[PDB]
Amino acid sequence: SMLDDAKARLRKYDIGGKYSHLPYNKYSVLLPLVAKEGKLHLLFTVRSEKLRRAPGEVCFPGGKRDPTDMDDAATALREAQEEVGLRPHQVEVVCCLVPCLIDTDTLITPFVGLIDHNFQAQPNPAEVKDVFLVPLAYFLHPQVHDQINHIFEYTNPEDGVTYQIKGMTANLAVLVAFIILEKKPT
């Protein structure tokens, strides 16, 4: 099946806990995969205009590890629950992708999660202004704007609203699309 085939692809790139004990400032992100209309999509958040860091920009759900978290995957699920109302029984964490090093002292660990078909987002307005889906296949043929920095522009055909996706968020989206969709019969 489409979902079994995705999980089996993703597991080949799992690094597990290999980098999780290093003495960094630690953040986790959830890359949430949603199946709609026969196809896989990624879920993104638009950050609240009131935040200090990157107000109004597109990112994945996630945040800073705290003392209650059993492991880095726990961080990503706690934060997703608080930001968009995703409950733990509504997500299967499939793997841990390569972590991102930033500013010499910070390590961001990405987890890919398969989301329940009946989940419906409840954005927390203090953190999240908007939630939207992008088909995974978009990231193989993106509409690119050069700011030289590559920015993706995605227009949702439901309402005609255009979003900008860039930076680490754009990089991780393309990575997931390659892992799942490369070399497939049609």
Ligand X SMILES: O=C(Cc1cccs1)Nc1cc(B(O)O)cc(C(=O)O)c1
Residues at the site binding ligand X, with contacts judged by CB under 6 A: 27, 29, 45, 47, 51-53, 59, 61-64, 79, 83, 108, 127-128
Task: State yes or no: 153 annotated in a binding site.
Answer: no
In this structure, are residues 123 and 129 in contact, taking their beta carbons and an 8 Å threshold? Answer: yes
CA dist 178 → 122, 136, 138, 171, 181 (Å): 29, 9, 11, 11, 5
Work out how close the CB of 179 gets to ligand X at its nearest, in angstroms, rounded to a whole number: 21
Task: State yes or no: 83 annotated in a binding site.
Answer: yes
Work out how close the CB of 124 gets to ligand X at its nearest, in angstroms, rounded to a whole number: 8
Q: Which residue minimizes CB distance to ligand X?
A: 63
Give whichever of 69 and 92 is closer to ligand X, judged by the CB atom. Answer: 69
Work out how close the CB of 186 gets to ligand X at its nearest, in angstroms, rounded to a whole number: 35
Strands 25-36 and 58-59: unpaired
Q: Which one, of 56, 31, 63, 27, lies nearest residue 44 by Cα?
A: 31
User: Residue ranges for the binding site?
Assistant: 79, 83
User: Residue ranges for the binding site for Mg(2+)?
Assistant: 79, 83
